[PDB]
Amino acid sequence: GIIPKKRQELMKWNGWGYNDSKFFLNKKGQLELTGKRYPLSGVALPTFKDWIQNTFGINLDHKTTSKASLNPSDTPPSIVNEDFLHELKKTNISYSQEADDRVFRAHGHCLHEIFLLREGMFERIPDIVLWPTCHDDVVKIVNLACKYNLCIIPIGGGTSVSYGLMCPADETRTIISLDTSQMNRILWVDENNLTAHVEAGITGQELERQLKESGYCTGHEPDSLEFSTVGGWISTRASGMKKNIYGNIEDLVVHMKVVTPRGVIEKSCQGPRMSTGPDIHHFIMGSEGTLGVITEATIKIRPTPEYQKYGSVAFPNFEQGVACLREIAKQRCAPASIRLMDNQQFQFGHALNQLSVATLLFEGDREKVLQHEKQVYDIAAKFGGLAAGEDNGQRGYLLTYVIAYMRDLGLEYYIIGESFETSAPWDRVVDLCRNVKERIRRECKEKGVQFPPLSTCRVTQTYDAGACIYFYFAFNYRGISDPLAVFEQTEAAAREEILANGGSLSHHHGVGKLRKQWLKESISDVGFGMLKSVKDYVDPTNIFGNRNLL
Amino acid sequence: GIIPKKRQELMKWNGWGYNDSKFFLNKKGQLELTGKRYPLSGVALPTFKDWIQNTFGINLDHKTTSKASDTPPSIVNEDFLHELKKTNISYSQEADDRVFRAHGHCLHEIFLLREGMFERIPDIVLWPTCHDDVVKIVNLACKYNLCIIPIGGGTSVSYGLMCPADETRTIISLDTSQMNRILWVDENNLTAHVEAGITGQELERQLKESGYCTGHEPDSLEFSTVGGWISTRASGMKKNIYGNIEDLVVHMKVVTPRGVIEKSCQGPRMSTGPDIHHFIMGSEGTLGVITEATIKIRPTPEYQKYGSVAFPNFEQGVACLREIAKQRCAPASIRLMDNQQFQFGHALKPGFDPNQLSVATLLFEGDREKVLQHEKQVYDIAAKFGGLAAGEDNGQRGYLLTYVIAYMRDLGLEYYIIGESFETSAPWDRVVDLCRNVKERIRRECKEKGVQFPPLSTCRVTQTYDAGACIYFYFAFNYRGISDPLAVFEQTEAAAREEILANGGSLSHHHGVGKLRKQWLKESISDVGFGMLKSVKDYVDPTNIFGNRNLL
């Protein structure tokens, strides 16, 4: 579960996930996933091809060829001051000027970046990779950057979907990719206080796995948990599948330690809730690597749940589903996870008419699950909601960690797709869903796309004040002059539609450099000025120069 | 329910709360609460005077003499006054209006109100009624170089309202009590759009008319305002169900010298950079004026039910509270009091060890079915710790009391009894030691400073969280024949704050910082931490219009 220094020995350098897990077309005509890693690994999927064909209007005859490894006569030169490097050596901090390690850490998982990895190359990439293995290591790195006017871009699991690790093309200084993956200890578990003191580089899978050994969990389960890190979550305000029980990352964090050019930020005590001015944890959460390096964090843990249980529900349409979820949030009896899929997604799940589907997960005490389960089904029964079965509800979840591998699959057959999200008020949810799908269909026809896009949505979280909505859109692009421009302009349009229908800039993807142009409207000008003024005091010479946000 | 421009028509100028509500010795020789505003109003408290005598060793034979209502003149630029005239915004240069808004409710202030005087008091009180009104005032204060000190309920317990002695600029008191509308209720999204001046009492009373509540109930809800809450990171009695302020606020609008802070949307939860709501929450009047907020509302609870539990000692009670927090089944309110609080609460009434036992009071609210289940789980857990139910009316008694405690301080003042309370939050594994060490420290400091009778030195756990608990301490003593009673109080308080910190507890859980705990802030938040806040202060308020000097 620990990320090795040479990441490409385990992970795709040019796509999502593990090397040993990819979708392919099998000796016997159907699609299938290699390796043994997921419940779906090595399992044939009979009707998936037919679906893709009916959905995207392709026949799978047309395959694209992508770079299978790095073209090192297309990577730019590593410029690194020779004295700095002398000093670094004295420290014993593992580092690498290798094109591979460098190019691995130049991108996250935005479509644009995955396309360049496969087809082109980046303008700018890290110059040197460093592996601190503890707080003190990081202190030394930051002090070296001050002395040598270097620039540091921190990286954790590299799962950013906001251009948050892209290197600014015109950044002339030595760029360090400060890689946290070897700084990954559970320092200690505090069984009286129910917290774990961890280092920032630990992944979600590793964190849970280790804790499960003492009988604990965090329950923070972002879909990227296999690679995303504690330090990444804080930085991007991440959200997990069971936030309903465990909380989101702002709910989960009790304490943190942060290395800035100016010094170390940490509160003096481990109180659960204080009143000592604006909460500085919140100046750091969602700071997206622009401020300094998060080395340590204390996070709430919980005893492993007694029992869990899946379910699902059918609604006569999406709208009645939304109404039902709103009523669930109104009674404040959301189960561990509740997710409403529209019809297109329902039909997609089938391959592995206005009718929609919620999937459910319940966990906690055995007795409580069963009460909770009864309440939810009764409420839904009020909205045309009929139980669709406990096993159906397992399929939708078992499926979660393999959806991300299908984007790589779709790219092999000339289909470009991305998911993007927002949060919106309850009273805007239906209109936004309708108007955003429409907007994408339009922006697509007008840019010359043949078959109308695939355009789905799902309610993914519920809140007192509204919901988190996810969209997925994809279109086959064979014939389009500039495929990357069409998609990118359509994405940027669907954002405009989101903002105009009352939805927020991001629920959890964060901002990075993809959504920078809207930030100032999102918060006020003064709002934006205040962040600026924290940047400028913490990092006066802009050493943390990924240029996210501002 | 709205606070009137002349506050002294309803409220004590020289102490807590309403004019018509004070303790007094009755025809029958028993202490009683005047008026009929609280359940306990007009009820005779038979054993109370004995408890006071036995605790502090007084007769009640001689009561102190307060001042009965010194005051620097009101100097104010004329071109400014002329322009203020034009806005039609009400204002006052009257000494008594200005003197009302120069303090909140820290012992030191209330004492200075009775005996001495404030070295500095605001120079002019203004009353905006709306957002625009505040924009104008702020624009003026920048133009004419005037300091602004916002005030809502005046219930600060941190010196957050005190005017800095050496501030030579004209100080405006920007009173928000007349900007108090529920702009509107959003029945679908379950939120309310409201002005910052609305009090807790008014907000709940109004919302109740539509079948809604916020459930945000600080002990000062009668006077404390939306604006103050956000400013001080307030916390209420039922935050277990309803959340604390930071959970309750969905949006806000802040007028600052630099301009208006405001998020563009009303979404439940976002990832758009560091959350700016959090730059403002806890800002204690140092950055601008919160004019409007959107707060979550909830349907009126269908059912409310009290209860109480008795434990063989305090440690056992703490352990139970920790287990209750471990199974995440805290009722709407749960509060564990130490033995002294039990005996105290006993003396105020209308086989374990009675000098050992501690008592938890409980409030349960929600759907009647849910309430009953919760209630069973809770008494099951307590029973494992030696816990036995002591009845709903005891529980009922516990809660209603909370609103009269603040009138009792005024009582003790007039019989040479200075007292105050202070809070902290700590991790679960420090609670027991922190309680013991802080009480013990308070006694030793008083013995050493030459107090005759040993001080009242109680504690209670007042909120539970996953990671810890909120702890209240209360301390009081007879000060007849002490040279410098204030200096003795304020030293002790400072010592006990050092103990709290040396035992693992925070600067404050909800009191906030103001100017009373400024000297620990930098170490509480890192040096860089403190520097971060200064940068925000300097950007937003370059010319330090908002000059209460809280925090930094």
Swiss-Prot record, chain A:
Impact reported for residue 287 to A: Strongly reduced activity
Record's keyword terms, sorted: Acetylation, FAD, Flavoprotein, Lipid biosynthesis, Lipid metabolism, Membrane, Peroxisome, Phosphoprotein, Transferase, Transit peptide
N6-acetyllysine modifications at: 22, 267
UniProt-reported outcome of changing residue 509 to A: Loss of activity
One GO term describing the cellular component: peroxisomal membrane
InterPro entries membership: Alkyl-DHAP_Synthase, FAD-bd_oxidored_4_C, FAD-bd_PCMH, FAD-bd_PCMH-like_sf, FAD-bd_PCMH_sub1, FAD-bd_PCMH_sub2, FAD-linked_Oxase-like_C, Oxid_FAD_bind_N
Pfam families (alphabetical): FAD-oxidase_C, FAD_binding_4
Annotated spans, Important for enzyme activity: 507-509, 546-550
Residue positions binding substrate: 407
Active site: 470
Required co-factors: FAD
The EC number(s) this enzyme carries: 2.5.1.26
Localization of this protein: Peroxisome membrane; Peroxisome
pH dependence: Optimum pH is 7-8.
Cystine connections: none
Keyword Phosphoprotein applies: yes
EC class of the enzyme, as a word: transferase
GO molecular function: alkylglycerone-phosphate synthase activity; FAD binding
BP GO annotations: ether lipid biosynthetic process
Pathway where it operates: Glycerolipid metabolism; ether lipid biosynthesis
Activity-regulation annotation: Inhibited by N-ethylmaleimide, p-bromophenacylbromide, 2,4- dinitrofluorobenzene and divalent cations such as such as Mn(2+), Mg(2+) and Zn(2+). Inhibition by p-bromophenacylbromide is strongly pH dependent and is highest at alkaline conditions.
Purpose: Catalyzes the exchange of the acyl chain in acyl-dihydroxyacetonephosphate (acyl-DHAP) for a long chain fatty alcohol, yielding the first ether linked intermediate, i.e. alkyl-dihydroxyacetonephosphate (alkyl-DHAP), in the pathway of ether lipid biosynthesis.
Family assignment from sequence similarity: Belongs to the FAD-binding oxidoreductase/transferase type 4 family.
UniProt subunit comment: Homodimer.
Name this protein carries in UniProt: Alkyldihydroxyacetonephosphate synthase, peroxisomal
Organism: Cavia porcellus (Guinea pig)
Gene name of the encoded protein: AGPS
